[PDB]
Write a protein that binds this ligand. Structure first.
Ligand SMILES: [Zn+2]
Ligand SMILES: [Zn+2]
Ligand SMILES: [Zn+2]
Length: 148
């Protein structure tokens, strides 16, 4: 995977909650997979998990933020990130930051993606499930509803 630093524009909590999900003491549907808030008011449209209103608002904005490389400015999951992996295919243009990858796919996963070439992101890959990341069967209709 190609990487970039994001254009300049919580962790403790996300980290603890992901541990609890992995340990089967919390459901991923009951946390905001983007920031870790427990004030879940909707379902994340791409991946199994919850989303808070504030994150929904960021997602709506970030969807339209692209860099001059033709790729999305920010992480698909958390709408931020410092360093992001870029999907190897051109109809995609998505990015995933190393924090969410190591956190949700697993420790080592980012570095493994960085050294996989060509690399297809978690939205493009045929398997659909990577660690805690579980792509929705119906993300296109969810995504459409989400933006309408
Ligand atoms: Zn959130
Ligand atoms: Zn992220
Ligand atoms: Zn992709």
């Amino acid at each position: 995977a190609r990487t970039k630093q994001t254009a300049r524009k919580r962790k403790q909590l996300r980290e603890r909650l992901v541990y609890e999900v992995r340990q089967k003491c919390r459901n991923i549907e009951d946390i905001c997979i983007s920031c870790g808030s427990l004030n879940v008011t909707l379902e994340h449209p791409l991946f199994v998990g919850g989303m808070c209103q504030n994150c929904k608002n960021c997602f709506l904005e970030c969807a339209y933020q692209y860099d001059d490389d033709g790729y999305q400015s920010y992480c698909t999951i958390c709408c931020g990130g410092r360093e992001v992996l870029m999907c190897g295919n051109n109809n995609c243009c998505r990015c995933f930051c190393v924090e969410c990858v190591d956190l949700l796919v697993g420790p080592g996963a980012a570095q493994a993606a960085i050294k996989e070439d060509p690399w297809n992101c978690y939205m493009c890959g045929h398997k659909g499930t990577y660690g805690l990341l579980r792509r929705r069967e119906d993300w296109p209709s969810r995504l459409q509803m989400f933006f309408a």
